Design a protein around this nucleic acid. Structure first.
Ligand code: NA
Ligand code: NA
Length: 326
DNA sequence: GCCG
DNA sequence: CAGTACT
DNA sequence: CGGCAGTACTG
């Protein structure tokens, strides 16, 4: 790179401020500008040069050269005093901008205030109980041990079940925020009813410690978001996210769960410009949308046995998981 | 915020 | 439904 | 002007 650390650091402060106050589109713009600056080959030195970069318009350019010439951004000095507290609250799993702003308006300023006085959803109480742990990253070797724990439990009652760790893990990062386990079966019918068996097996060995999202009274459950802990000393609580998909959806589910988030959004954006649509379920062609870009007609699912097919069908060069950070 |  | 979450 | 991804739970 990063050849603009002085600049991006200041913009990031402003970006998170907008995000936590709920201004998600302004925050999105800052995010793309900030990445474009982190990615640039040289220090940006001119107004004209700032505008040349994709994701940076006249307004963001002005902020850049103000930092360049003065070493400060005046906008930073006029950020609401609530933003630090809002960010503190919003880092509780299950609480977002709306809840953080409510708690603030209700007078709360600390996690102690929240713990003792605030109304917490079941998820938010769990998030609060694990507040520090949910902000830590684990070494990728620990993600391997968690994936193996889920895989052995799954394969124990169906040996044909395929399990793979996705997200930051599959993208080759040294550390992982959580573990993303995708599960499928190559026959095409077996994946039906496996969450109940898997979750009970993982509970019985004491591996799962809390559940955040888990609809298991239905049968069509798609995801489990919860908390686990490996046995022995020195272990922390880790976020575990599992999805079970039909085999025909494997490549699209793999692509989605591997990410990154920005990479997915970017890929789905491109698909829409081509009258196509990409989700975690499928790549579809002939999608009918109105002038507001909303799906009003279904389209048809395209066969996508591998990730490479999805890229291919979108007219895109393949990109290996480690190359999908942005 | 950016951009078509 | 709005809010929050997943990548 | 207006879209900025497309989904899955919770209550
Ligand atoms: Na949160
Ligand atoms: Na992850």
């Amino acid at each position: 790179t990063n050849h603009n650390l002085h600049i991006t650091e200041k913009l990031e402060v402003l970006a998170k401020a907008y995000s936590v106050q709920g201004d998600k589109w302004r925050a999105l713009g800052y995010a793309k500008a900030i990445n474009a600056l982190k990615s640039f080959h040289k220090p940006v030195t001119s107004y004209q040069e700032a505008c040349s970069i994709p994701g940076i318009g006249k307004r963001m350019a002005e902020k850049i050269i103000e930092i360049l010439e003065s070493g400060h951004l005046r906008k930073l000095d006029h950020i609401s005093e609530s933003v630090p507290v809002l960010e503190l609250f919003s880092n509780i799993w299950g609480a977002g901008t709306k809840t953080a702003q409510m708690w603030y308006q209700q007078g709360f300023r600390s996690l102690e205030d929240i713990r003792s006085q605030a109304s917490l959803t079941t998820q938010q109480a769990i998030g609060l109980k694990h507040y520090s742990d949910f902000l830590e990253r684990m070494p990728r070797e620990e993600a391997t041990e968690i994936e193996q724990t889920v895989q052995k439990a799954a394969q124990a009652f169906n040996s044909g079940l395929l399990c793979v760790a996705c997200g930051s893990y599959r993208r080759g990062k040294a550390t992982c925020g959580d573990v993303d386990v995708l599960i499928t079966h190559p026959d095409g019918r077996s994946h039906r009813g496996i969450f109940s068996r898997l979750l009970d097996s993982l509970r019985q060995e004491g591996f799962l410690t809390d559940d955040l999202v888990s609809q298991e009274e239905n049968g069509q459950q798609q995801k489990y978001l919860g908390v686990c802990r490996l046995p022995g000393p020195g272990r922390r609580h880790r976020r575990l996210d599992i999805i079970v998909v039909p085999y025909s959806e494997f490549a699209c589910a793999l692509l989605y769960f591997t990410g990154s988030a920005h990479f997915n959004r970017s890929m789905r954006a491109l698909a829409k410009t081509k009258g196509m649509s990409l989700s975690e379920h499928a790549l579809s062609t002939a999608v009918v949308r109105n002038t507001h870009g909303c799906k009003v007609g279904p389209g048809r699912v395209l066969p996508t046995p591998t990730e490479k097919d999805v890229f291919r069908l979108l007219g895109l060069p393949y990109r290996e998981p480690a190359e999908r950070d942005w």
